Design a protein around this nucleic acid. Structure first.
Ligand SMILES: [Mg+2]
Ligand SMILES: [Mg+2]
Ligand SMILES: [Mg+2]
Ligand SMILES: [Mg+2]
Ligand SMILES: [Mg+2]
Ligand SMILES: [Mg+2]
Ligand SMILES: [Mg+2]
Ligand SMILES: [Mg+2]
Ligand SMILES: [Mg+2]
Ligand SMILES: [Mg+2]
Ligand SMILES: [Mg+2]
Ligand SMILES: [Mg+2]
Ligand SMILES: [Mg+2]
Ligand SMILES: [Mg+2]
Ligand SMILES: [Mg+2]
Ligand SMILES: [Mg+2]
Ligand SMILES: [Mg+2]
Ligand SMILES: [Mg+2]
Ligand SMILES: [Mg+2]
Ligand SMILES: [Mg+2]
Ligand SMILES: [Mg+2]
Ligand SMILES: [Mg+2]
Ligand SMILES: [Mg+2]
Ligand SMILES: [Mg+2]
Ligand SMILES: [Mg+2]
Ligand SMILES: [Mg+2]
Ligand SMILES: [Mg+2]
Ligand SMILES: [Mg+2]
Ligand SMILES: [Mg+2]
Ligand SMILES: [Mg+2]
Ligand SMILES: [Mg+2]
Ligand SMILES: [Mg+2]
Ligand SMILES: [Mg+2]
Ligand SMILES: [Mg+2]
Ligand SMILES: [Mg+2]
Ligand SMILES: [Mg+2]
Ligand SMILES: [Mg+2]
Ligand SMILES: [Mg+2]
Ligand SMILES: [Mg+2]
Ligand SMILES: [Mg+2]
Ligand SMILES: [Mg+2]
Ligand SMILES: [Mg+2]
Ligand SMILES: [Mg+2]
Ligand SMILES: [Mg+2]
Ligand SMILES: [Mg+2]
Ligand SMILES: [Mg+2]
Ligand SMILES: [Mg+2]
Ligand SMILES: [Mg+2]
Ligand SMILES: [Mg+2]
Ligand SMILES: [Mg+2]
Ligand SMILES: [Mg+2]
Ligand SMILES: [Mg+2]
Ligand SMILES: [Mg+2]
Ligand SMILES: [Mg+2]
Ligand SMILES: [Mg+2]
Ligand SMILES: [Mg+2]
Ligand SMILES: [Mg+2]
Ligand SMILES: [Mg+2]
Ligand SMILES: [Mg+2]
Ligand SMILES: [Mg+2]
Ligand SMILES: [Mg+2]
Ligand SMILES: [Mg+2]
Ligand SMILES: [Mg+2]
Ligand SMILES: [Mg+2]
Ligand SMILES: [Mg+2]
Ligand SMILES: [Mg+2]
Ligand SMILES: [Mg+2]
Ligand SMILES: [Mg+2]
Ligand SMILES: [Mg+2]
Ligand SMILES: [Mg+2]
Ligand SMILES: [Mg+2]
Ligand SMILES: [Mg+2]
Ligand SMILES: [Mg+2]
Ligand SMILES: [Mg+2]
Ligand SMILES: [Mg+2]
Ligand SMILES: [Mg+2]
Ligand SMILES: [Mg+2]
Ligand SMILES: [Mg+2]
Ligand SMILES: [Mg+2]
Ligand SMILES: [Mg+2]
Ligand SMILES: [Mg+2]
Ligand SMILES: [Mg+2]
Ligand SMILES: [Mg+2]
Ligand SMILES: [Mg+2]
Ligand SMILES: [Mg+2]
Ligand SMILES: [Mg+2]
Ligand SMILES: [Mg+2]
Ligand SMILES: [Mg+2]
Ligand SMILES: [Mg+2]
Ligand SMILES: [Mg+2]
Ligand SMILES: [Mg+2]
Ligand SMILES: [Mg+2]
Ligand SMILES: [Mg+2]
Ligand SMILES: [Mg+2]
Ligand SMILES: [Mg+2]
Ligand SMILES: [Mg+2]
Ligand SMILES: [Mg+2]
Ligand SMILES: [Mg+2]
Ligand SMILES: [Mg+2]
Ligand SMILES: [Mg+2]
Ligand SMILES: [Mg+2]
Ligand SMILES: [Mg+2]
Ligand SMILES: [Mg+2]
Ligand SMILES: [Mg+2]
Ligand SMILES: [Mg+2]
Ligand SMILES: [Mg+2]
Ligand SMILES: [Mg+2]
Ligand SMILES: [Mg+2]
Ligand SMILES: [Mg+2]
Ligand SMILES: [Mg+2]
Ligand SMILES: [Mg+2]
Ligand SMILES: [Mg+2]
Ligand SMILES: [Mg+2]
Ligand SMILES: [Mg+2]
Ligand SMILES: [Mg+2]
Ligand SMILES: [Mg+2]
Ligand SMILES: [Mg+2]
Ligand SMILES: [Mg+2]
Ligand SMILES: [Mg+2]
Ligand SMILES: [Mg+2]
Ligand SMILES: [Mg+2]
Ligand SMILES: [Mg+2]
Ligand SMILES: [Mg+2]
Ligand SMILES: [Mg+2]
Ligand SMILES: [Mg+2]
Ligand SMILES: [Mg+2]
Ligand SMILES: [Mg+2]
Ligand SMILES: [Mg+2]
Ligand SMILES: [Mg+2]
Ligand SMILES: [Mg+2]
Ligand SMILES: [Mg+2]
Ligand SMILES: [Mg+2]
Ligand SMILES: [Mg+2]
Ligand SMILES: [Mg+2]
Ligand SMILES: [Mg+2]
Ligand SMILES: [Mg+2]
Ligand SMILES: [Mg+2]
Ligand SMILES: [Mg+2]
Ligand SMILES: [Mg+2]
Ligand SMILES: [Mg+2]
Ligand SMILES: [Mg+2]
Ligand SMILES: [Mg+2]
Ligand SMILES: [Mg+2]
Ligand SMILES: [Mg+2]
Ligand SMILES: [Mg+2]
Ligand SMILES: [Mg+2]
Ligand SMILES: [Mg+2]
Ligand SMILES: [Mg+2]
Ligand SMILES: [Mg+2]
Ligand SMILES: [Mg+2]
Ligand SMILES: [Mg+2]
Ligand SMILES: [Mg+2]
Ligand SMILES: [Mg+2]
Ligand SMILES: [Mg+2]
Ligand SMILES: [Mg+2]
Ligand SMILES: [Mg+2]
Ligand SMILES: [Mg+2]
Ligand SMILES: [Mg+2]
Ligand SMILES: [Mg+2]
Ligand SMILES: [Mg+2]
Ligand SMILES: [Mg+2]
Ligand SMILES: [Mg+2]
Ligand SMILES: [Mg+2]
Ligand SMILES: [Mg+2]
Ligand SMILES: [Mg+2]
Ligand SMILES: [Mg+2]
Ligand SMILES: [Mg+2]
Ligand SMILES: [Mg+2]
Ligand SMILES: [Mg+2]
Lengths: 92, 48
RNA sequence: GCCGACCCGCGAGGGCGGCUGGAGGUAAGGGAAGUGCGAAUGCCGGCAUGAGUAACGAUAAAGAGGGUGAGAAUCCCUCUCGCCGUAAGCCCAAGGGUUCCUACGCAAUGGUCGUCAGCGUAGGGUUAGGCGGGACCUAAGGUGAAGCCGAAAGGCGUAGCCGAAGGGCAGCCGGUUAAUAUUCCGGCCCUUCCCGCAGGUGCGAUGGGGGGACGCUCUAGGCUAGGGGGACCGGAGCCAUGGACGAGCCCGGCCAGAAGCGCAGGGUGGGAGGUAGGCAAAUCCGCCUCCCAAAAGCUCUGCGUGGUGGGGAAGCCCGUACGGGUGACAACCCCCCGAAGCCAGGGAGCCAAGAAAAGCCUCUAAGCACAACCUGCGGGAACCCGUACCGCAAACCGACACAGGUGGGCGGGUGCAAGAGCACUCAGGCGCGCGGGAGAACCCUCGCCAAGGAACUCUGCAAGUUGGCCCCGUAACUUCGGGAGAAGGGGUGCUCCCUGGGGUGAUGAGCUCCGGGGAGCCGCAGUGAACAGGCUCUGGCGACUGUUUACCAAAAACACAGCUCUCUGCGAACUCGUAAGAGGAGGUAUAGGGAGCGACGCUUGCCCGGUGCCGGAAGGUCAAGGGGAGGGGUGCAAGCCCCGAACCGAAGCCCCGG
RNA sequence: CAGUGGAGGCCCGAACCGGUGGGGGAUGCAAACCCCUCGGAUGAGCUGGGGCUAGGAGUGAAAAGCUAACCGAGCCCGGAGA
RNA sequence: AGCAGCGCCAGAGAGGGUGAAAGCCCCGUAGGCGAAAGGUGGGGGGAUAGGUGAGGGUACCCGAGUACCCCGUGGUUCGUGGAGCCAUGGGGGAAUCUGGGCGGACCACCGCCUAAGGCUAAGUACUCCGGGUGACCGAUAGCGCACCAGUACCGUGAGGGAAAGGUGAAAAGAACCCCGGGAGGGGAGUGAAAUAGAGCCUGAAACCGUGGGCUUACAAGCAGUCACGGCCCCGCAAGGGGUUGU
RNA sequence: UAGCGGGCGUGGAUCCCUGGAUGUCCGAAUGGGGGAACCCGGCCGGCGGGAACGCCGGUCACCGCGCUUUUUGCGCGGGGGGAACCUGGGGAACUGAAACAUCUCAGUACCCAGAGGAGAGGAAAGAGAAAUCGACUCCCUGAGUAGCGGCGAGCGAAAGGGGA
């Protein structure tokens, strides 16, 4: 149970913005600590994280026909990898 | 002019809240009917 | 279902024909009922009438050129014009909940239009040890082990626990995105936790003590925010339209910052002995004794400085968008005004006498003294939730893009005596999401009016007059304060001249604050605009400030200080509760409950027959109960069973008095 | 007596609280608004936040006022097809 | 699947569907078969717990704040009544079969029953749930809800509480061209039918409209009716229909 | 539930019955709190470099009964839900009586506790008039009788008999 905190990378000009610097932001699992997003991405991309930042993404409400919706909630965490390091895995 | 509905969430929840309803035999029946009627919301909701 | 001028029937009906419809229907003869509608201000739905009518939601206001586009009064851009500017600008909190930013789009929503939008589709967007909240404290209150009470449900309640805009706690300046930023980045600066160590000390708390820890009004010293002037510093520019190349005009001359130093403040007595108190744990605190210093020292905070980091205008080219360059290598300095903020637990006066608990410090107990505390340094660790956007409103509460409502902070300049007032105006933001014409009555809001001047009218209702400041002056009456802004008057602008005082500097100049004297000028008019009392006299009621019928009454009603009566001796009376219990009150007759009157002045008469209340150990009546003569039913009886006189029996009522 | 001092349910007046008179509004901007005027404005003051008190009950500077836009007894469901 | 011709089945001619009206096409129906697993299960069987005698003597025991009595009440058909019985808040308070209770005051007789400890299946009640059936509804009915309803919306809250079903057999859901920014249409095309074209079966009424016929600007009105007349229309005429001038 | 993009099935897929597994968070909700779905812990293990931080597995509410050496312990149980039915505790008023008070409505409505596939009741200190019957419950009947009653309005049994 570890490739479970990491969900998928966030893909957005703004996400990319910080690849250049040391900053990889991705969708984590909503109940994850920063203490865990850490030991997670650490044992997952074989880097050292010096800094995790998080924020919830209250899910917007879409709709269709009369049927009135509500998209699921989320939690970007954004990791600042030890100096110099990188994650080719993401740098496409 | 000051109308009557002056929302405040602590208030809403402290007073018609679930914890609150369970607390008294009165509210317990309320939950009871609410449920036995098949209401979707058993008690007012509060976005804070 | 639609049509029929045909047929049958007294009629409700039935039949036949044509057209529509496109999958059910149900003889003769019987049976059974949710069985026939025009009305119920009936119920549901649809659709009319009024009527192309009223309205299109503040009278802050528009106009033009260009662009976009199938289509523009209505969207973008530009110029001109207008409105807000203690706001109609800006930042918090609440509520709201994606309304934020992009891209595409206009069916509906938008009171018109719409290419636009707060609308539809889609994608993005909210980053924190230090901001806020939680891994802290306690408040009313809530909950609640014990315990108490209640038919049940439940009520009360100690300890404790929960509860915050209050206590405690470590981040300031600046840059960057379309959209977040004490959150990312830059710079400077901090906090806890753990580990190792150095040094140090009897260490150690949930217990003891200190502290935190407090009202109102007025207020000093110093400083900051903030603001004004500068001939001084920097700057691209400008000479118009009669004059000016100048001490010209226009722009800008700051921000953060550890140690240290300085300025200003807060806090704090030191030493020794004795101790019976802080539920006998103490080196602490309290209290007694004497000696010293009377202030420093030590401790803390604010500001200034401070290594250095940052920022930095008008104007000009590119520009839809919105910025980026120029733009300086910018300058970054003097002087003045100055807080309600800071130093902060400052000071003085007053009576109505002004939270708690933790942090922090200190004392010790158990326990440990190879621990453990304390200080420095090094290395490590530091979670959870909020963070978009709206926020006096078109995004909150008002069914609405509603002229209503909504707590805190900032809120520039000039002028006016002052100000958060008024007029104009920066920054910033708007012209209120139907327009165009016309120039009738009538309505609304507003201006003016000959002569008169309350004749109006229920009433000077309404309007008007008056209006600020300065000086002169001011009555009855008075409770000596008042009445007073009584009344009534005069002055007020601008120019030159002489001059007094206060402030900063230094005592001086400059700046600034408040004046006094003369000479003179113009106009109808000088608080030239805006803010801005009409006055007197005399009755009634109510003393007075206050309170009230949210939405027809604001008053002479309620309240009130004050007066009298009355109850109440404390487990008080009284009130809420079935009770426990609580309030009264952690009060104690100078108190508390009830009642009436209602500042203050002078006063308050007679009538206890009735009613109430208070008193009255007599008497009279008086219930259960006690009593048991006497009578009854039944049995063969012993018995069992019932009725019942006198007589004893409270309060109440009677009676007696106040 | 003068000085100093800075009291007060003191005075004038914004914010703020309020509703005196008039006009307007009356299928309203508005189920209580607008304009002009007016009252209080250091107090028996106004106000945010957290709490407690309710139906014969609470609260009431007392109007039978208020208790979620009609209160001489709230609203809801029920007895109920009184 | 109708009509026609000739057949067959039936322990099955209940019902449903298939392009309309099917015993024989389809799913069923009659009849009959089936459980490894879970549940149920004395109905059958077995076992265990338990249980069962007669006479005599003895007078030990046989449910206590109980019986019983009185005061206050409840239950019962019983409303204080002649008021018992059962129950019990207050007071007094026994006996152990020569004991006690009852048989409607009470007493005597006769007779009944054994209080003050407890347990016991079935027959009974109901219907959230599953199924079967209807001289039950057929979308304003039937549940409030046939549909995404205890919703939307309304209320602080308890709580209130809707509307809304149907193309066609099959989507074959209308390529493509044309006008239009779109919408929407006109052709083309599909279909038996498209005024079945997509909230689309049927499609009534009010209500709005376009065309045509008769009529109306000296006329008085519950709007109609009776008469005559003119015009228009159906029929050869006799006739009728529409309109309305007086 | 079409579509885009991909797969699976006679090596019996889908699907239906049965048993098992997993089963976040809240809710009796039970480690503590709390404004339900959130927040914060103690203990024993585990994870990461892992002491600080975080996560993962387990475990910790309260009451009653039993056992245990006071106790600490250990086990068994309770708690909450359920359309209607049932039982116990409590218990109206409109209304009827053509007013109204006894009375009626009605031990109904409802509130509360409990029970359960039912619940109650149940093996005579009975019936009540026959030297008779023989637990209890249910239906028929007895009977609108007996009676009760401001003898108003109304209310209204039992024994016995036939049944389950
Ligand atoms: Mg949307
Ligand atoms: Mg027909
Ligand atoms: Mg038939
Ligand atoms: Mg028949
Ligand atoms: Mg009918
Ligand atoms: Mg009918
Ligand atoms: Mg009718
Ligand atoms: Mg009418
Ligand atoms: Mg019309
Ligand atoms: Mg008109
Ligand atoms: Mg008009
Ligand atoms: Mg307008
Ligand atoms: Mg103007
Ligand atoms: Mg224009
Ligand atoms: Mg162009
Ligand atoms: Mg174009
Ligand atoms: Mg063009
Ligand atoms: Mg103001
Ligand atoms: Mg939206
Ligand atoms: Mg923004
Ligand atoms: Mg539109
Ligand atoms: Mg429009
Ligand atoms: Mg509108
Ligand atoms: Mg456009
Ligand atoms: Mg366009
Ligand atoms: Mg455009
Ligand atoms: Mg930092
Ligand atoms: Mg934690
Ligand atoms: Mg006690
Ligand atoms: Mg606490
Ligand atoms: Mg902080
Ligand atoms: Mg922003
Ligand atoms: Mg920004
Ligand atoms: Mg060493
Ligand atoms: Mg010590
Ligand atoms: Mg020692
Ligand atoms: Mg301590
Ligand atoms: Mg201490
Ligand atoms: Mg202390
Ligand atoms: Mg203390
Ligand atoms: Mg304080
Ligand atoms: Mg300054
Ligand atoms: Mg300055
Ligand atoms: Mg220069
Ligand atoms: Mg010139
Ligand atoms: Mg200028
Ligand atoms: Mg200029
Ligand atoms: Mg000095
Ligand atoms: Mg001592
Ligand atoms: Mg000693
Ligand atoms: Mg000692
Ligand atoms: Mg010492
Ligand atoms: Mg010591
Ligand atoms: Mg200084
Ligand atoms: Mg400085
Ligand atoms: Mg400086
Ligand atoms: Mg410097
Ligand atoms: Mg320097
Ligand atoms: Mg360190
Ligand atoms: Mg933000
Ligand atoms: Mg507003
Ligand atoms: Mg609204
Ligand atoms: Mg508007
Ligand atoms: Mg306000
Ligand atoms: Mg200011
Ligand atoms: Mg407008
Ligand atoms: Mg004039
Ligand atoms: Mg005149
Ligand atoms: Mg004149
Ligand atoms: Mg005149
Ligand atoms: Mg006259
Ligand atoms: Mg008169
Ligand atoms: Mg007047
Ligand atoms: Mg004048
Ligand atoms: Mg006067
Ligand atoms: Mg002047
Ligand atoms: Mg000097
Ligand atoms: Mg004045
Ligand atoms: Mg007189
Ligand atoms: Mg007089
Ligand atoms: Mg008087
Ligand atoms: Mg007054
Ligand atoms: Mg009023
Ligand atoms: Mg007390
Ligand atoms: Mg007491
Ligand atoms: Mg007390
Ligand atoms: Mg006292
Ligand atoms: Mg006197
Ligand atoms: Mg007298
Ligand atoms: Mg005597
Ligand atoms: Mg005798
Ligand atoms: Mg005798
Ligand atoms: Mg005899
Ligand atoms: Mg005798
Ligand atoms: Mg005697
Ligand atoms: Mg007596
Ligand atoms: Mg007496
Ligand atoms: Mg004063
Ligand atoms: Mg005053
Ligand atoms: Mg005054
Ligand atoms: Mg205020
Ligand atoms: Mg008022
Ligand atoms: Mg008034
Ligand atoms: Mg009017
Ligand atoms: Mg206050
Ligand atoms: Mg009531
Ligand atoms: Mg209501
Ligand atoms: Mg009834
Ligand atoms: Mg044959
Ligand atoms: Mg058939
Ligand atoms: Mg088989
Ligand atoms: Mg079988
Ligand atoms: Mg059986
Ligand atoms: Mg045997
Ligand atoms: Mg045996
Ligand atoms: Mg014998
Ligand atoms: Mg007794
Ligand atoms: Mg007896
Ligand atoms: Mg009785
Ligand atoms: Mg009785
Ligand atoms: Mg009687
Ligand atoms: Mg007897
Ligand atoms: Mg008794
Ligand atoms: Mg007898
Ligand atoms: Mg006898
Ligand atoms: Mg069923
Ligand atoms: Mg059924
Ligand atoms: Mg329906
Ligand atoms: Mg319908
Ligand atoms: Mg249903
Ligand atoms: Mg609403
Ligand atoms: Mg298609
Ligand atoms: Mg077409
Ligand atoms: Mg073609
Ligand atoms: Mg277009
Ligand atoms: Mg279309
Ligand atoms: Mg057809
Ligand atoms: Mg048709
Ligand atoms: Mg269409
Ligand atoms: Mg349609
Ligand atoms: Mg039609
Ligand atoms: Mg014709
Ligand atoms: Mg004519
Ligand atoms: Mg014709
Ligand atoms: Mg398992
Ligand atoms: Mg759970
Ligand atoms: Mg919990
Ligand atoms: Mg922990
Ligand atoms: Mg662990
Ligand atoms: Mg290691
Ligand atoms: Mg356990
Ligand atoms: Mg033993
Ligand atoms: Mg249960
Ligand atoms: Mg029942
Ligand atoms: Mg009656
Ligand atoms: Mg009657
Ligand atoms: Mg009647
Ligand atoms: Mg009952
Ligand atoms: Mg059960
Ligand atoms: Mg059964
Ligand atoms: Mg049973
Ligand atoms: Mg039983
Ligand atoms: Mg027995
Ligand atoms: Mg019995
Ligand atoms: Mg026998
Ligand atoms: Mg009578
Ligand atoms: Mg009865
Ligand atoms: Mg049977
Ligand atoms: Mg039966």
């Amino acid at each position: 149970t570890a490739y479970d905190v990491i969900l998928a990378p966030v893909l957005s000009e703004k996400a990319y913005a910080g690849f250049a610097e040391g900053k990889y932001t991705f969708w984590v699992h909503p109940k994850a600590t920063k203490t865990e997003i850490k030991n997670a991405v650490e044992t997952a991309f074989k880097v050292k994280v010096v800094k995790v930042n998080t924020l919830h993404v209250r899910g917007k409400k879409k709709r269709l026909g009369r049927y009135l919706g509500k998209r699921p909630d989320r939690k970007k965490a954004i990791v600042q990898v030890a100096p110099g390091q990188k994650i080719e895995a993401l740098e496409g | 002019m000051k109308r009557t509905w002056q929302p405040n969430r602590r208030k809403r929840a402290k007073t018609h809240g679930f914890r609150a309803r369970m607390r008294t035999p009165g509210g317990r029946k309320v939950l009871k009917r609410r449920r036995q009627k098949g209401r979707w919301r058993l008690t007012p909701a509060v976005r804070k």
